[PDB]
Structure formats: C-alpha cells, structure tokens
C-alpha cells in the first residue's frame, strides 16, 4: 500500500503541477529551487546546518548542498524503505524533475539514490566514506512540465538567496553559476 500510494502521489503531482507549485512558467521553475532550499533552511533553523550552496550546473541542473545532519537513511517500519527514499519520493521537486540525485553524508558513509520523474532507479546504495555530514540534491527540471523554459535566471536566484540570508542570520548561502565554464560567477551571503 506504501509503494502504491507513492506512485499515485507522483501521478497526481505530474497531472496538476500548477496546483502544487503555482505554475509551470519560469516562476514555477524557480520554485523548485526554493522548495529544496527551504528544507535546508529548516535544518539550519533546527540547529544543525549553517552553510547552503546553490549551483546552477551545466545544462541547467541545480545542485543544492547543506552541511546538516544528512537526510536519514534508516529503514522505516511503515514504508519498509529508507527514510531518504520516502522523503524524496514525496517531494514535488522530484516528481517534476526528469532526473534527481541525492548524496547523503551520514554515519561516516556516503549514500546515493537516483530518480526519474520521482521513480527510484535503484535502491539506496553506499558509495563511499566521509568525515562530514550533510545532503546534496541535484535535479534537472522536466521539460515536459516546464514547457516555456527550463533555463534559470541568475539574478532571480540571487535576489531571493540574498533575502533568505538576510532573514536567516548566521546561515551562509552561496550561489554559483557554472553553466559557462569560461566565466563562473559566485555570490555568497552571510549576515552577522
Ligand atoms: O537535512 C536536510 N536537507 C534536506 C534537503 C532536501 C530535502 C530534505 C532535507 C533534509 C532533512 C529532512 C527533510 C524531511 C524529513 N527529514 C529530514
């Protein structure tokens, strides 16, 4: 019933994405970033993170990294699945991404899962070791949903990131644009 209900949730999001994110315009594209960043901000506000990095990667992938605890990876009684999998398969960003990847740094271990339109492509796997904690989310917006544009506007992101750093003092929030490897821009914000 768990896994069935995941799939039904993906279907509902992809059928009426504007009910979930406001629109499928440029504004809705950018909302995908805000949904992921808000999760990292909550982790900071809970006392566990103080650095968030947003990268616009080649081909308009987005990478969001925080230094929080890492999304949990323990197996749930309820879903029988790792917690990160449950959390990300109920994410609107995941449903509305043609591809999404997570890397969790937790328990001295690096865990990885990938998804397409929210569907896990393989079981969560240990891929390496670490002495840090935190979460990396990378996603590519689905052009089947975002039919006007899939290209992010640096100044739109910059504006709101600076605002979020001013509101959430003590969190360092960095924006980087790597889409043109010959001219990389980086703004980083850290209030008091
Ligand atoms: O520490 C975190 N960084 C994130 C980035 C994207 C999505 C979720 C999270 C998160 C923690 C989390 C989110 C939901 C439930 N439990 C833990």
């Amino acid at each position: 019933a768990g896994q069935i209900q995941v799939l039904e949730g993906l279907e509902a999001v992809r059928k009426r994405p504007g009910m979930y994110i406001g629109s499928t315009s440029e504004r809705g594209l950018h909302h995908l970033v805000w949904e992921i960043v808000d999760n990292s901000i909550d982790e900071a506000l809970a006392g566990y993170a103080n650095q968030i990095e947003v990268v616009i990667e080649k081909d308009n992938w987005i990478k969001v990294t925080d230094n929080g605890r890492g999304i949990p990876v323990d197996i749930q009684e309820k879903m029988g699945r790792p917690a990160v999998e449950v959390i990300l398969t109920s994410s609107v960003v995941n449903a509305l991404s043609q591809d999404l990847e997570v890397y969790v740094h937790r328990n001295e271990t690096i865990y990885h899962q990938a998804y397409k339109k929210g569907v896990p492509q393989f079981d969560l796997k240990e891929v390496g070791t670490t002495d840090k904690t935190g979460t990396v989310i990378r996603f590519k917006a689905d052009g089947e949903i975002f039919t006007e544009t899939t290209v992010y506007n640096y100044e739109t992101l910059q504006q709101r990131i600076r605002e979020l750093a001013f509101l959430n003092k003590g969190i360092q929030i960095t924006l980087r644009d790597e889409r043109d490897e010959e001219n990389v821009r980086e703004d980083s914000y850290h209030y008091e």
Side-chain angles (χ1 to χ4, degrees):
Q3 279 289 120
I4 290 164
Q5 261 39 241
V6 162
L7 287 175
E8 291 171 351
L10 297 178
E11 178 190 25
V13 181
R14 290 183 62 77
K15 181 138 62 203
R16 319 185 168 88
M19 304 188 65
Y20 287 85
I21 62 164
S23 71
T24 64
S25 75
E26 189 168 338
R27 296 224 269 247
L29 182 74
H30 290 80
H31 184 89
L32 297 178
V33 180
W34 309 132
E35 279 312 315
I36 300 304
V37 170
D38 185 69
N39 296 323
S40 295
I41 294 173
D42 284 347
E43 183 70 355
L45 298 177
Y48 298 112
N50 73 352
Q51 288 179 252
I52 303 174
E53 180 194 62
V54 177
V55 186
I56 325 171
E57 298 187 298
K58 179 190 176 76
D59 300 330
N60 288 278
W61 283 78
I62 294 288
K63 183 172 64 180
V64 183
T65 305
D66 70 54
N67 68 344
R69 293 165 292 177
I71 304 172
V73 298
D74 64 286
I75 304 293
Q76 299 204 336
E77 237 64 274
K78 205 86 79 269
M79 223 65 47
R81 308 301 297 168
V84 58
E85 185 186 298
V86 179
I87 289 158
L88 291 184
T89 60
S90 70
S91 171
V92 160
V93 177
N94 199 11
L96 303 182
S97 291
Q98 60 156 91
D99 287 280
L100 185 146
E101 301 169 351
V102 64
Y103 296 85
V104 175
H105 292 237
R106 187 168 171 124
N107 311 314
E108 295 73 47
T109 307
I110 308 170
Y111 306 83
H112 179 58
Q113 191 169 44
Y115 318 82
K116 293 177 180 292
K117 306 175 178 175
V119 182
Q121 303 293 289
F122 46 87
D123 287 343
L124 187 70
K125 64 169 170 197
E126 299 186 345
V127 297
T129 63
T130 184
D131 61 359
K132 314 253 180 70
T133 68
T135 301
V136 181
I137 296 295
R138 299 184 67 238
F139 69 88
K140 184 156 171 71
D142 187 357
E144 291 178 33
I145 301 295
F146 295 95
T147 56
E148 285 298 302
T149 188
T150 52
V151 174
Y152 294 93
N153 178 307
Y154 187 90
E155 285 70 28
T156 302
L157 294 174
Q158 182 184 25
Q159 190 189 171
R160 179 55 178 168
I161 286 167
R162 180 176 180 133
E163 185 162 51
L164 291 169
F166 178 74
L167 300 176
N168 302 284
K169 296 171 216 290
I171 305 182
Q172 176 192 77
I173 315 179
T174 299
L175 176 62
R176 183 159 63 258
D177 188 357
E178 294 178 346
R179 291 173 291 183
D180 178 355
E181 72 286 347
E182 302 187 322
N183 172 221
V184 175
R185 302 189 50 177
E186 184 169 276
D187 292 78
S188 187
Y189 300 94
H190 184 193
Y191 283 84
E192 277 240 19

